[PDB]
Write a protein that binds this ligand. Structure first.
Ligand SMILES: Nc1nc2ccn(CCCCCc3ccc(C(=O)N[C@H](CCC(=O)O)C(=O)O)c(F)c3)c2c(=O)[nH]1
Ligand SMILES: Nc1nc2ccn(CCCCCc3ccc(C(=O)N[C@H](CCC(=O)O)C(=O)O)c(F)c3)c2c(=O)[nH]1
Ligand SMILES: *Cc1c(COP(=O)(O)O)cnc(C)c1O
Ligand SMILES: *Cc1c(COP(=O)(O)O)cnc(C)c1O
Ligand SMILES: *Cc1c(COP(=O)(O)O)cnc(C)c1O
Ligand SMILES: *Cc1c(COP(=O)(O)O)cnc(C)c1O
Lengths: 462, 461, 462, 461
């Protein structure tokens, strides 16, 4: 045994499974807003010898030896990270060691806050992520809610966007030490300046969780939260089109002046953020992911990537305006970023019913809770994203077509919800009813044949 | 732009770095015991299309859709996770989604324990990990020591082993809810039966953090902590020779019969999984999860049975070689993949030997010894057989590795006679062109010896 | 030494100090809303041999012996407590061991809640007590805020009373487990049914801190929170006119039915409340205070006590309507209980300035934060109470006179605030300025000579 | 209605109870060591006009007004609090507002420690108080064990003393922020110098909870914990013979000189006071605060010097009497006011002797012994000299108290030969008219002996 055998000539059970997921990725229309296809240049460094390296610590301050080469990859990933977002290395640092998006946020709380200190983050069914703190009125779901006390701020259920005033009201009563301006299902921009006004008012911290919009900020197509936020976290997938990892952008340098001494008051963010990642929470960094990220950060400071993000924005509206003009309402009026919040309630169906139908014809989205919803097991609305398919060189006409696929798929279950009872009934007929079974195999063949001829990034075979 | 351009063309600055580390791994003797060389088959799955698949949830109970294939992968990994450790699927479950070993341990604590519940783990200078609760004399270091209250147990310095008698005495006053039977710098076998008794007495859970010995347990060359623990965390790298991920083995099914006849169940499966997701993590790194399942399939094969059994013979060969050269070994010798060396007799300290051996491409790490306070320059080295054994090293090769080490020791010994402080020491190695030469001739001799050995994984990166 | 010597023939330094406080109590107009004069029948049991008895535990379940007589005093204080508030001993219990008002509340949180569980209580400057949780936007003041996370609910600064809607808003976001409907500076009643609606809505507990209004509830003159609250705490002084102690009224019996089994679901309040007091928080009960309380609870179920509370209510309005018709505004319109919230802002002065002036002429009140206030060191408004002087057999004409004393005292500092700068200046002139020094010695002589001829309760000499 | 009617007229039901307890106190032998008889002068201040004075704050810094007189009282109490323990007013402050001893201890913890910080106190079955953190095998009992994490230290069962060597060994692993040097059922002197060294080594605060020995310390008949502790909590009852309240003595002024020359201060005065109010308590019980100052003035007088010195001679007289009658004393004897008795040799258990002695008006309490688990019927009694010594008891009187005790022991011994369980035992004492007689003749003999002794306080209530 040499360890250099192929994955095919050794483990075929896994190799066929790899190609099936590749075929499934290629034959399908991926509309998960947080999904995206990675470049082969990044995947090559992901499956590299850098996986065989323990580099616990930070460059110049390891607790081992032989970290001489990985110290140049972190210090480069750090440079490329600040490069991609136009950040002076005198006002900003970055921690490239977070394993993913959730471990990145958990490190920031652990760094700045104390256990059970107060946190405000957008409520989860109001388009938030659970890493912002999610208590389910029965049990504490996210570890953010367990180790720290979290109170959510909500949407205005009429306007459909962030109630910057009720949040500006609760912060004075709740006196939090950290407010998280970041989303996972919200189709508008965010005023990262009213948040900073609320944060400066209640002496809190403004954390920017710019995941989902990571690339749009790097390509300068939407406003950058670094203008008025002091700590910015993000993942490396979603939009930045890299491998699965996380980042923590913290502001360094000088905070202000001693108005009566003239002494320098420094930003004390750095050494706390760096300490929380290691040694507190993590151990051996995934250096093979740091490289695959630095690769994707390089190809993010490039004009090729701005054309990508601009197409992503244009493909969002071209999916919204197409969906608007077909019998569908758009939460928050329409969109302003990469994803759209479809409301299926003014259409007689829901995200839970449409998904399973759409999921069965190689079109992948997810359910979503809209303001105009009534429960949880049947949420009214879907989450549709652009960056996934735009990487296959999708255009406005290419997206107005999958809308014609969606509406041609929504109106398949719409004749079954009017013919069956609940979710367990809905899905049951979709699999044996030959009038609907064969009705799906037509759309699946039409969806696969349409999508499979688009240039998928990454390796050809896996 | 297609996203199918190679890295060698798209980004040369990074591609030139993959070769600098691939050469450094190929040209150096790797003795960091927590380090192994992942196979090419597993590394292929690491950089696969699975990086583009958000599959939040668990096979079946998943939030999104389209996980029809990655469900079969995670279910194949869960199947191969148990077969490697000979676990009955009706008595054991496994969570294959921990991003690494540290997030695996934090998931167990978050699942079973409320915040500020009590955990006991071996002290860090005594051989324990950070994730077993390390608390400095002034600050809370590990996050386990922050969201939970931790008290460590110590070695018996006279024997270098875990003092299972002081643990039992201290665990009755501290009354923890979880005691951890995992180590990093421990050259001996853990008395898991003695641990469970203590955990039983004080109504606590026994956690086995077998990250260092996971491959030895899988090949059944050492006793298995599954026979005495009910929660087993492990890393998929190290002695398992896989991609960087973590696994949580737990018990399920009938706990015991009620004294009535009621069937008391196990309550790990649902708390453990809920802690990993949605509580702590999120999108499962489906590429590592698949790359892990490749390494697990190898661990079920006789090649691993011979590899792991060779890892033991090479540690003894490394241990006996140091002993015959007048080296003190903590606990006298070794029963696994590790060899703890005590350099205080020979006259050097681990901080100096780590620098010299590093300059000749012999990667080890300094280790504290039973006795000297943590506020002291360490007088010990931690050596590991897993890495080079994957490069087909054998018994006669580690006696040579010890020979190269001893020549490196006698250099820092000569330099220590010439150097005063430590920061001065790390300059005399780089400036004094008489010792700068001596290190170059040992570096070259070492690299020539190492390059001739095969390296698992890709050839160029 | 026999231990039976008099306090005079042994410690005269303390005896003269005792009589001076007695003379100070008699010669002055006490307007602290939480103060009151105790009956000699209670003070006799307070300084009794019951101080020499350790009775840790509860009747029938002591951990000593010889508690045979104190077991009959607790079981009687328990009976008299439920008697005074018309409570069926099958639906209600009481813990008579709380040392005071603050230790009573701290026991209820410790009993029902977990550390860092969530608590909502009326904000302190909005007429609350700190035992409801008071964080000062810098440090955690009350131990309620340290051991549990507290978020306050505020007053409507226009209406001047409890914003039952903004509280009904925050409870859904904050998801507390306990809301405290009790006041220390609020002149209206409290809807102990909208609170219970908010508590049943967010699955919280309704704690009634009926201190300040303890006697008014016992005399049936104002609504009783026991109608819709499940845990009721109170002190024994303030209105109930007893010794310094506390009480914890908890509901026992059956909570509801198992609608699918018919089994009894019991109120699990009792054994937690009893356990938190002993052994958790306290040790040896002050049996000499339990007796002095049971004495005052006896003389509270009597028609003599209803005449008292009715005079207290009538003396409040007769102080409000008198203050209204003299150039003073009343927060919350007027009053509805025992105390009035004077607003000195529409009069050019404040509670901090008036107090020190009033305090210097044997008239004792305190500062108070009204909604229409601008800071903290100079709060605009005073807190005036009835139960203190009403125990000296005060009538409406007797209270309209001290208002004529107050307004004749307010307009003494009103010529000094218009002649001095801040608080440190204000008080400084009051002590050397012979034009104001002698101007006070006239009012002090007129206040002392007026008040000293009223029947003070308690011992004649101390 | 004037509020000046006497209790004898206003409420007879309660007045008839003040006499039933006054008679029971006068007619019984009081051996509950935490129990003394308050003087009449202090009891006069207890039921005074000061109960009608809300004086929130501290002398000067007070919220309300009109506290011009109660300020002089609290300042007189603070002056007499220090003079009783010979404390320099420039080195020590005192908070005289704790409602009792338990709220006094909680104030110290809340002031100095953050929630879930670590406290070490003597175990409750070993002699410690609840407020030193008692944590059952299943539940958190004391509130100290809830808002803080507590680990107890134990006695050395071979010697009955505190094992100061296991404390130092366990305090290095637990690393507490506060160690408590207070006891309830401890018949010996605490090595406060050995405690402070341990607190110094692990960077912890030494708390002295001298509630039981406060009067002995005030009279300088035993070593003073102020000479080694920096926070001293105490009750104003027990050996101090005052009303029920608690005091917190702390250090202030210069801590030490900085190694520079900076003057490092003490940070207790402002944290301690803020914890008592506004953090924890509210309206100071000004009646107890004044009644305390009367008891403190007595503690500065030679009468207390003779009273406390007599309390010691009477405990030895009680100890030596039990020894000469074949009784086992925990730790062999006594050095204070207490005498711990071990009834396991004689054949009875503390739960049975407490019932028999209670039925003859000899009030003691059962005490666990070094050895038997807390889940066992206690085989020991706790006896105290403070109470009866206030009734002018002397050495020859306690030998008689032991004689009355021994006759009571031999009754339960005869009953134990006749009784099986314990709930049966407490019925055979009440039904069997042959033993019902035997207890009546001992009860009468005891009460006649006791009534002849004077009783501090009022005559009728
Ligand atoms: N037996 C055993 N061997 C190994 C080999 C590698 N590891 C993995 C972890 C390496 C060391 C953990 C660590 C990492 C960082 C610090 C650290 O930052 N300390 C102070 C901060 C205190 C202050 O700021 O006061 C400082 O340096 O500033 C530490 F104190 C220990 C282990 C292991 O975990 N256990
Ligand atoms: N050395 C020493 N002597 C004395 C003499 C009096 N005291 C003062 C305190 C008396 C005992 C403390 C206490 C008080 C109550 C319990 C108690 O409630 N236990 C369980 C609850 C557990 C469950 O419910 O599982 C139960 O009975 O139900 C206890 F377990 C100990 C002391 C002292 O503190 N120390
Ligand atoms: C998706 C997301 C995360 C978590 O990403 P993971 O890789 O699953 O950890 C965190 N924050 C935001 C805003 C996200 O959208
Ligand atoms: C290596 C190791 C871990 C995990 O380290 P990570 O790099 O975070 O995966 C956990 N416990 C022990 C004992 C280990 O050796
Ligand atoms: C005054 C008050 C208290 C506290 O009374 P204390 O005797 O000082 O402990 C508690 N709750 C309320 C509503 C109060 O008015
Ligand atoms: C008696 C005592 C206390 C206080 O008990 P309380 O009745 O609450 O005042 C505290 N510590 C010790 C050691 C005691 O003996």
């Amino acid at each position: 045994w040499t360890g250099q055998e192929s994955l095919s000539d050794s483990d075929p059970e896994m190799w066929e499974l790899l190609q099936r997921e590749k075929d499934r990725q290629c034959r399908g229309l991926e509309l998960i807003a947080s999904e995206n296809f990675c470049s082969r240049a990044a995947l090559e460094a992901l499956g590299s010898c850098l996986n065989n390296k323990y580099s616990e610590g930070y460059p110049g301050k390891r607790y081992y030896g032989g970290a001489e080469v990985v110290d140049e990859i972190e210090l480069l990933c750090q440079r490329r990270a600040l490069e991609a977002f136009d950040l002076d290395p005198a006002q900003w640092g970055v921690n490239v060691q977070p394993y993913s998006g959730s471990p990145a946020n958990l490190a920031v709380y652990t760094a700045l806050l104390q256990p059970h200190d107060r946190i405000m983050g957008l409520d989860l069914p109001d388009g938030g992520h659970l890493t912002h703190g999610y208590m389910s009125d029965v049990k504490r779901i996210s570890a953010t809610s367990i180790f720290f006390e979290s109170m959510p701020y909500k949407l205005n259920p009429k306007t459909g966007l962030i109630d910057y005033n009720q949040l500006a009201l609760t912060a004075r009563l709740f006196r939090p030490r950290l407010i998280i301006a970041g989303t996972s299902a919200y189709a508008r921009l965010i005023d990262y300046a009213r948040m900073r006004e609320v944060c400066d008012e209640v002496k809190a911290h403004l954390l920017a969780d710019m995941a989902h919009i990571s690339g749009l900020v790097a390509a300068k197509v939407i406003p950058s939260p670094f203008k008025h936020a002091d700590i910015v976290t993000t993942t490396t997938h979603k939009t930045l089109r890299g491998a699965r990892s996380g980042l923590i952008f913290y502001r360094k340098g000088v905070k202000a002046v001693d108005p009566k001494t003239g002494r320098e008051i420094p930003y004390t963010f750095e050494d706390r953020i760096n300490f929380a990642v290691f040694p507190s929470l993590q151990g051996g960094p995934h250096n093979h992911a740091i490289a695959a990220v630095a690769v994707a950060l390089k190809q993010a400071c490039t004009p090729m990537f701005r054309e990508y993000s601009l197409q992503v924005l244009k493909n969002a509206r071209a999916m919204a305006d197409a969906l608007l003009e077909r019998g569908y309402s758009l939460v928050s009026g329409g969109t302003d970023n990469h994803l759209v919040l479809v409301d299926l309630r003014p259409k007689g169906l829901d995200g839970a019913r449409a998904e399973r139908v759409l999921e069965l014809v190689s079109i992948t989205a997810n359910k979503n809770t809209c303001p105009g919803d009534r429960s949880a097991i049947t949420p009214g609305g879907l989450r549709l994203g652009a960056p996934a398919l735009t990487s296959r060189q999708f255009r406005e006409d290419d997206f107005r077509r999958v809308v014609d696929f969606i509406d041609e798929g929504v109106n398949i279950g719409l004749e079954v919800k009017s013919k069956t009872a609940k979710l367990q009934d809905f899905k049951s007929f979709l699999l044996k009813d030959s009038e609907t079974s064969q009705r799906l195999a037509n759309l699946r063949q039409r969806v696969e044949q349409f999508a499979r001829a688009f240039p998928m990034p990454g390796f050809d075979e896996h």
